[PDB]
Design a protein around this ligand. Structure first.
Ligand SMILES: CCCCCCCCCCCCCCCCCC(=O)OC[C@H](COP(=O)(O)OCCN)OC(=O)CCCCCCCCCCCCCCCCC
Ligand SMILES: CCCCCCCCCCCCCCCCCC(=O)OC[C@H](COP(=O)(O)OCCN)OC(=O)CCCCCCCCCCCCCCCCC
Ligand SMILES: CCCCCCCCCCCCCCCCCCCC
Ligand SMILES: CCCCCCCCCCCCCCCCCCCC
Ligand SMILES: CCCCCCCCCCCCCCCCCCCC
Lengths: 100, 131, 162, 54, 475
């Protein structure tokens, strides 16, 4: 007897928490962690919606979501490796020399 | 039903008693017995001589590429996990789908092996010079 | 069922809030593990058993890779903790705090007006998910294989040494 | 009085306003990634609030 | 439902591009051959382009709940295939100067083209999400292909982080829409409604955040000059043409099919976004000394014009053919402009030639490239005798028919601002400044053919009108 609004609100709370972590953190690793929180919250919202309607499509969208999350984390870790190799620091404010 | 809720209670009690037994053994180990005092007791063990630096360092692993590939391949594995529990219902059409999926998986694996993405052994440890 | 849902959701919220406002990277990864375990418990409380199992299964491996990278780069003792703590200030977080709060307020206001009959929590099996996945969603499976292939190729090209 | 062509300057006013507005808008492109994420969040808040009020 | 052999025939460009992805990757695994792998990639893309004829002979029908193949999907598949073929042609002389491995470029281009084809055929929220990521992630690789440079690594990191954020936004919006509607199909988004349900509107708003990031629409536009400048020039060609075209096509299909496309609040929000996009993109390009950043702000403005054409989709009946004609003209003009940039940056030697001082006086050493670039500057300005004017005329006609007077005035004002900076570039080509391979000549032939097509279809647009009007979806 869990309300659908309660699951959606929990997913929204996790989403805005991940977005806040993405904004307020200068370290690229913490930004990738916040991105993982964001995509996992969206996947949780899809799971909640699929469970409300009694459909497998919620978990199917969840599977596609975490496939994207895995490949995105892979690419982000490769880019973080390049940033660390070519800057010796993970400060995301340092990579800002294109502007205007 | 009743067997289902009995098994739910059994699972709960199983987990609770297991964690409580671990905590109880940790507490009993902590409080029983004496304690040793030495000048160099709280120095990390490095075969009897002082360290150069410490264990807090940028230790570069060589298998990090394989770690990225492992994350990708674990997601492919879950796609196959979903397929394998419903093979009879999906029929031969689902078999053709999974065969294409597995072939793309294996082609990616072959590509990774052939380009040396899965090789991180140093050249002196590749064991080329044999009798 | 609702007991598990509310407690696991509360644990997930608290652990995620601990993650985004933490200084030690290994501790942050442990709180991320706890939050993802809690979200998997939320999935199990809603009858999405396959999603909860996959949530624990593939993030245990993924955060292991994050630990590998944290040991490779970040962990240095108190140097990275001092550098990260100096990067966090009251102004730096209070700026986006109201932005996230008003985004949450608008999203929650939109949520509260929807028609809700309740989630009965009837389990949707892994067999049904597999039937749908290789039934109506065949092209999703094959193009997801292509997506993971693209991730492989990008990771190989970028994350190399020489 | 008129040797400066005042009507020509009056019709050159919109070009000056265009330069000013463009230089002001280029300040938002500072190159910082966290500001770009913050601007995406700001736009999300604005879009959602506009959809809620209408 | 299952996959019929007829459905397989309608799946032909997707199947051919996936097969050539596998073939090119296995050839890379066998032996790194830049010429052979580039040839196999362009052969696969050409095979998909000519299999479009068999797809047309099949007819218009549904392939699974996820895909629907009609003439609209044919047109946008052809557009993204032309963009990918031109990108590969520009990429070869650029990659000839690349010291690291060059064969992965074509693999990533092929996977991105596959994502573009999926977005052309997308009829589902799952299909739209998957097509967006299938376009985006190979572009994470391609934008940072020259990761040994500052700018390419910066653009890769920016594009990757911001596109992951936009994907999270789009997925959460999709989940809210699904929670409201109970169906992920496009036609059922608002069937159970009184159409202004708050959760449906919020879900479509978060999807608008993600999709407007992908289309460089204000205020989700700030990445565009940075990523356009940082990326390699053939990557900038692909990112400006194929990604924008495919994502705008699936946005058109979604707003045509979903019953919430007729809601007034969504239309007003899109009108605000289109107005701000046109004005802001034209204003920010006024003082740009870099050709890539200027073209990025230009892309923001042109997607604003397309958004104006999309706002009037429910009102009139000319909006979809207006979008088709506009996208054909914009594809050809962007191909010419970014291809001249690529050919001036070929072979790769580190930092590309993107300053306007480099193109100042281009006519005295590269007269044909100067003529192509000035034709493209005239076309992007919407000047008559160019196809860009025909697109602008379609946008203005569609806006006038729907009484969108604010957007019509925005198009006029933005066109004047565009006139300024485009004519500045075009006349800087002819001032006074202080290769030798068949693949470079193929790139030159591509930009010359684009220039001739822009001129001829600006003077005589009726064949393009007939082609776009033939490419009609299922109502
Ligand atoms: C603090 C410690 C952790 C507390 C949270 C996790 C346990 C919560 C309490 C669960 C007790 C059992 C229970 O409530 O079972 C109900 C339901 C079983 O499913 P169902 O068949 O629907 O049951 C109703 C009868 N038909 O149960 C479910 O569907 C969900 C089962 C529990 C959730 C899975 C485990 C979550 C682990 C969280 C770890 C957090 C980090 C450490
Ligand atoms: C070196 C090697 C070179 C290889 C060649 C490369 C260059 C040439 C590429 C050739 C591509 C051919 C594509 C052919 C598409 C149309 C095929 C066809 O027969 O369409 C007819 C069909 C309607 O007719 P019918 O078949 O009777 O349908 C009745 C019910 N189905 O029509 C339809 O249903 C709609 C058809 C139109 C869809 C758009 C056209 C395809 C995409 C074009 C993109 C570019 C357009 C802009 C440029 C125009 C220049 C004039
Ligand atoms: C060195 C560069 C650092 C960039 C940090 C960017 C942080 C941006 C924080 C934005 C906070 C906005 C708070 C709400 C403002 C009012 C609502 C939006 C405008 C109408
Ligand atoms: C003082 C010398 C000036 C030389 C100008 C040469 C102009 C050549 C133009 C070629 C065609 C360009 C495209 C026109 C449309
Ligand atoms: C800077 C752009 C200014 C655009 C002005 C457009 C004016 C449109 C006025 C429409 C009025 C409609 C009244 C009914």
């Amino acid at each position: 007897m869990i309300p659908l609004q309660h699951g959606l609100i929990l997913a929204a709370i996790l989403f805005v928490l991940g977005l806040t972590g993405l904004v307020i953190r200068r370290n690229l690793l913490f930004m990738l962690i916040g991105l993982e929180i964001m995509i996992n919250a969206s996947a949780l919202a899809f799971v909640v919606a699929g469970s409300y309607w009694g459909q497998t499509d919620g978990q199917v969208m969840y599977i596609l979501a975490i496939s994207l999350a895995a490949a995105e984390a892979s690419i982000g870790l490769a880019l973080l490796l390049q940033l660390h190799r070519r800057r010796q620091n993970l400060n995301i404010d340092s990579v800002s020399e294109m502007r205007g | 039903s009743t067997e289902v809720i009995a098994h739910h209670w059994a699972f709960a009690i199983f987990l609770i008693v297991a964690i409580g037994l671990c905590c109880l053994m940790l507490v009993g180990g902590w409080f029983l017995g004496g304690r040793a005092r030495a000048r160099s007791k709280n120095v990390p063990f490095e075969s009897g001589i002082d360290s150069v630096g410490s264990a807090r360092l940028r230790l570069s692993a060589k298998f990090y590429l394989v770690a990225m590939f492992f994350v990708i391949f674990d997601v492919e594995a879950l796609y196959l996990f979903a397929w394998s529990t419903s093979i009879r219902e999906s029929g031969w059409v689902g078999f053709v789908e999974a065969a294409i999926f597995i072939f793309v998986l294996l082609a990616g694996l072959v590509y990774l092996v052939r380009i040396g993405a899965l090789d991180w052994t140093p050249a002196r440890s590749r064991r080329e010079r044999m009798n | 069922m609702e007991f598990a849902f509310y407690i696991c959701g509360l644990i997930a919220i608290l652990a995620t809030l601990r993650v985004i406002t933490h200084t030690n990277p290994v501790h942050a990864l442990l709180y991320l593990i706890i939050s993802l375990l809690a979200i998997s418990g939320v999935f199990f409380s809603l009858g999405a058993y396959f999603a909860g199992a996959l949530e624990i299964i593939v993030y245990a491996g993924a955060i292991m890779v994050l630990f590998v990278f944290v040991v490779m780069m970040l962990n240095l003792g108190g140097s990275e903790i001092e550098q990260e703590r100096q990067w966090l200030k009251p102004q730096v977080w209070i700026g986006p705090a109201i932005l996230s709060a008003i985004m949450l307020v608008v999203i929650v206001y939109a949520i509260l007006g929807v028609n809700d009959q309740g989630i009965d929590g009837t389990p949707i099996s892994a067999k049904a998910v597999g039937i749908t996945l290789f039934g109506p969603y065949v092209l999703a499976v094959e193009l997801a294989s292509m997506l993971l292939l693209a991730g492989l190729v990008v990771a190989f090209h970028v994350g190399r040494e020489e | 009085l008129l040797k400066r062509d005042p009507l020509n300057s009056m019709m050159n006013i919109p070009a000056v306003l265009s330069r000013f507005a463009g230089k002001g808008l280029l300040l938002s492109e500072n190159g910082y990634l966290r500001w770009y994420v913050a601007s995406m969040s700001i736009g999300a808040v604005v879009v959602l609030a506009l959809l809620m009020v209408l | 439902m299952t996959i019929t052999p007829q459905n397989l025939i309608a799946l032909l460009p997707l199947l051919i591009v996936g097969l050539t992805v596998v073939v090119v990757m296995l050839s890379i695994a066998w032996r790194r051959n830049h010429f052979l792998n580039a040839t196999l990639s362009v052969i696969g893309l050409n095979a998909a382009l000519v299999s479009l004829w068999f797809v047309g002979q099949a007819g218009a029908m549904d392939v699974t709940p996820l895909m629907r193949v009609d003439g609209f999907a044919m047109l946008y598949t052809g557009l993204v295939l032309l963009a990918s073929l031109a990108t590969c042609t520009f990429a070869y002389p650029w990659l000839e100067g690349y010291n690291d491995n060059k064969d992965e470029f074509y693999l990533l281009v092929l996977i991105a083209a596959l994502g573009g084809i999926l977005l052309a055929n997308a009829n589902h929220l799952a299909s739209l999400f998957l097509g967006i990521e299938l376009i985006s992630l190979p572009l994470f690789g391609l934008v940072g292909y020259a990761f040994r440079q500052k700018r390419s690594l910066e653009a890769s990191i920016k594009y990757t982080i911001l596109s992951a954020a936009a994907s999270s936004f789009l997925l959460f919006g999709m989940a809210l829409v699904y929670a409201q509607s109970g169906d992920l199909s496009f036609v059922a988004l608002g069937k159970n409604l009184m159409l202004n349900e708050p959760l449906l509107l919020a879900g479509f708003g978060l999807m608008i955040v993600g999709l407007g990031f992908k289309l460089s629409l204000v205020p989700f536009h700030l990445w565009t000059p940075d990523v356009y400048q940082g990326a390699p020039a053939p990557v900038s060609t692909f990112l400006a043409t194929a990604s924008k075209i495919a994502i705008f096509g699936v946005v058109m299909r979604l707003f045509l099919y979903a019953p919430v496309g007729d809601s007034e609040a969504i239309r007003v929000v899109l009108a605000i976004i289109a107005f701000a996009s046109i004005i802001f993109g034209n204003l920010m390009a006024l003082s740009q000394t870099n050709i890539k950043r200027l073209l990025g702000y230009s892309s923001i403005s042109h997607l604003g014009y397309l958004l104006v054409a999309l706002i009037a989709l429910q009102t009139g009946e000319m909006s979809m053919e207006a979008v088709g004609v506009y996208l054909a003209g914009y594809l050809f003009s962007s191909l010419g402009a970014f291809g001249v940039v690529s050919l001036m940056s070929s072979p790769y030697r580190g930092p590309d030639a993107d300053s306007l001082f480099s193109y100042r006086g281009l006519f005295w050493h590269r007269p044909i490239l100067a003529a192509v670039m000035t034709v493209m500057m005239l076309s992007l300005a919407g000047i008559p005798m160019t196809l860009g004017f025909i697109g602008k005329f379609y946008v203005l006609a569609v806006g006038v028919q729907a009484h969108l007077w604010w957007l019509v005035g925005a198009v006029v004002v933005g066109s004047a601002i565009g006139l300024y900076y485009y004519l500045r570039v075009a006349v800087s080509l002819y001032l006074h400044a202080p290769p030798s391979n068949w693949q470079y000549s193929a790139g030159g032939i591509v930009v010359l053919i684009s220039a001739l097509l822009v001129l001829v279809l600006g003077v005589w647009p009726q064949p393009l009108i007939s082609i776009v009007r033939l490419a009609m979806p299922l109502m």
